[PDB]
Structures are given as C-alpha cells and as structure tokens.
Copies of this chain bind each other. A is one copy, B any other.
C-alpha cells in the first residue's frame, strides 16, 4: 500500500503537554498512537529559527529564559501578556525535558524503531513566524544581528520579506551547521529538508541562480549523509518538501528533477504552504518528470480547507474531505499521502474522534473504497514572484453565460448517490440554474445541510446520474438566468 507520512511540528508537543513534569514513559507513549496504522514514517520537526532540543551550534527555544522568573521577563517582554502563557508553555516544557536528561527526539526515534515506524527528522529551512516582532522569543540571535542577510530590503509587506537569502554563503553555512549537528546527534532513517517553511529563500528576481545554489547545497547534504551511512551501518534517506506545480517549484529556485536525476534525493513531497490543502495537484506530470530516478512522490495535505484566498472561513478538513483528497491523489499515482498539521490535539482536524479511523484508511485505495467522501474545489496558495495566478473561486455567471469547474474525484464511484453542490455568495429558484455533469442534466435537490467544513452562504444540491461520473476529473457546467457568484463547489459520493 502507498501509506502515510505524518509530520509532528517543532512546538505542538511542548505547547499541549505544558504544566506537567513529563516522564520518559509518557514521552514514549506519544509514538504508540501511530503504531499499527498506515503510517510508514513520522517526520519529527525539531526547529524553527531555534531548536526545541539542547543544541550546541544553534539557540534552543529557552535561550535567555529565567525558569524561576515571572512571565514578564526579557525573553517574553515583546509579547502581549496572555500570549506569553502559551509561548512559556513551549519554552518551559522543552527546558524541563533537558533538565530531566530526556532528549525528546532521541526517545521518539528509539520508540518508532521498536513500533515498526521509520523515524525521520524534518528540518524547517527558513521559518519566519512573527518576524514583524524583531524582539520575539523564537527568532535566532543570528537573524536579529544580521538584517543584511534578508531577501527583501526595500519593503515589509509579508513575513517572507524578512526570511534569510540562501544566495548568501553565511546563510547556507548557518543551516548546514544544524544539519551537521542533527546527523551526529540522531540516528534517523531520513532527513527531510522542509523548504516549504516558508518556501521563499532568494532575492526576488535571482531564483535561476538560486536553483543552481540549492542543487549544490542538496549535493553537500547527500555527501554528508553518505559519510554517516558508514559510521551508522545503514542507508540514510534525503527528501524535500517543494511546491505543488513544477513551474512554481523551479520559479522558487527548486529544480527537483535535477536533484532526482543526480540521485541527491529519494523522496519529494509536493504540497501547499498553509492557507488550504490542495485537492487538485498535477501528480501525473510529476510522475512523468521523475520516471526512472527511484524517487518516492508524496502528496502533501494541509489541515485547512478554504475555497479562495480572501475567504474569511478558517475550517479544517474532516474525515470525509481527507478521504476525498486521498482517493483523488492516490488514483493519480501518489506513492505516499503526507499530512502536515494533522496532530493529536490543538493543531488538528476538528472531528478529532475520527483521527484513529483516518490513520487506518487514507494510505490505500482498498481501505477508502465504498466509504463516503467529499471532493471540494480549492486553490494553490504558493506562486513564484510575478508568476500568473490561476484561482477558480469565486466565479460570477451573468444571465445566459456558461461557467465550468473541473474537480478531481479519483476512482469511478461505487453503486450509490453522487451530489454536485454549489454555494452562492451575496435569491434563486429551482430553474435559475441548469447544471450538467459531463454533458448530463442534474436534477435540483434543494438546499443541502453540509457537515463541517462548510461555507456561511446557501449550498444547492444537484443529483448527478451515477453513470455520468468518470475516473479522474469530473466537469460541472452551469448556466444562470440571473447574475450570481459561486463561492463553493463540491462532489459528495455516498455508497
């Protein structure tokens, strides 16, 4: 079966377990929820601009920390009073584990290997959370002291504006120092260069030179791990997270076809940044690009599910919507489903009771088969600077005009019900819309009470004749008698 790669971020475990002395036994139990599922690999993130373990070459999260002191101390001063409580949870929990001689990543790796999971280290290569606050606890003293090493000096409109420029040798050396320590300190099966935090690593306009620079950096990483294979006596993998379309990937200085062909990486994770999980990604094109290279292609899901970038909705995926994306992507040739931000609490799916069910279904077409699923239209949140953007929603239809929406619904539906659903933003009757799926007339059903995630405007349901649906993309065509704007579209498949 393809199976699941699940990412545990750098902060979550420390935020959620704060205020309790953690025993080695408890730390170990975290790995156990993942045993005997479709999870093949845990990607354990130990860093932002700072480490959550006791690094000797970077700043740990607790550098500057007074354990005994009040919340209002120099490290937390720049935060509002209530946000210091959460930040100090992370800082104090990670500190107290060090004090107790517990290395969390050393214990998780060891427990993974007992429970038949492959343990990975995922490194955040260029995290910029809260760089609007130059005094923030989670920035490195290296970032604070070296404003000249940033990507964009002439403006500050986005956090990525203040990310590090890997065009600079001092910047590449800074990140290679952590990878050198991480190789030494931890015997992991694989290192995953998480380029997708936050995906922007070069001066605007120098991305072509950047592609050469990143390919050369990757080669140095692979050479280092080749040396640790001998010391460690087992193969060590190298993977990377990159954008969802191949033109955007190259446009952000990530030429992965070259990394693959030169044998530098053996896994690639195509993924959005954050704003929504892309239900539509061109997997088939990447498979053709990567033919013969021995690289596993993983399709990355994010937790949010949102219809367009300006939407005020911030709801997460549900078991049904993840079943929809999983079936789609596996059908298109994904060799792994990768879950970022699907954790056991706080940053997680809102229907959390379904978590164990999810970890045992979405890694295979046979386990998803004949279970209800939802294929929601969304959008690509990440484009190279000045690259034309393609955003389906929202969509206006004037009187007598036609609008089409293609949605990837993966395997041909089993015997059962198929609904096409359309949310209208801003007053329709049953004859205002004519809806066809693959040419075929769909019967009006009336208003549909959607489970979360759902818009906050009316959703109208159309009955699709079962035999209309095909394998892969499905085409919703509509014409309106009155001017309307669409803000949501999905297929629901219910055997």
Contacts and interface: CB of A to CB of B under 8 A. Distances in A.
Given A204-B475, A473-B205, A405 B386 contact: yes
Interface stretch (A4-12, A121-129, A388-396): A388-396
A215 interface: no
A172 interface: no
A479 interface: yes
Contact of A209 (B206, B390, B470, B476): B470
B154 A204 contact: no
Interface in A227-273: 245-247, 250-251, 257
Contact of A208 (B203, B208, B209, B472): B472
27 contacts: A152-B439, A154-B436, A154-B439, A203-B439, A204-B475, A204-B477, A205-B473, A205-B474, A205-B475, A206-B438, A206-B470, A208-B471, A209-B470, A245-B247, A246-B285, A247-B282, A247-B285, A250-B285, A251-B473, A288-B289, A289-B289, A385-B406, A385-B477, A386-B475, A386-B476, A389-B390, A390-B390
Interface in A130-156: 152-155
A203 B438 contact: yes
A479 B406 CA distance: 35
A406 to B, nearest CB: 3
A401 B204 CA distance: 16
A306 to B, nearest CB: 15
Contacts of A470: 205-206, 208-209
Nearest to A204: B475
A39 interface: no
B405 A157 contact: no
Given A386-B476, A388-B391, 15 more contacts: A154-B436, A155-B479, A205-B474, A205-B475, A206-B438, A208-B471, A246-B282, A250-B284, A257-B288, A288-B289, A385-B406, A385-B477, A386-B406, A386-B407, A390-B390
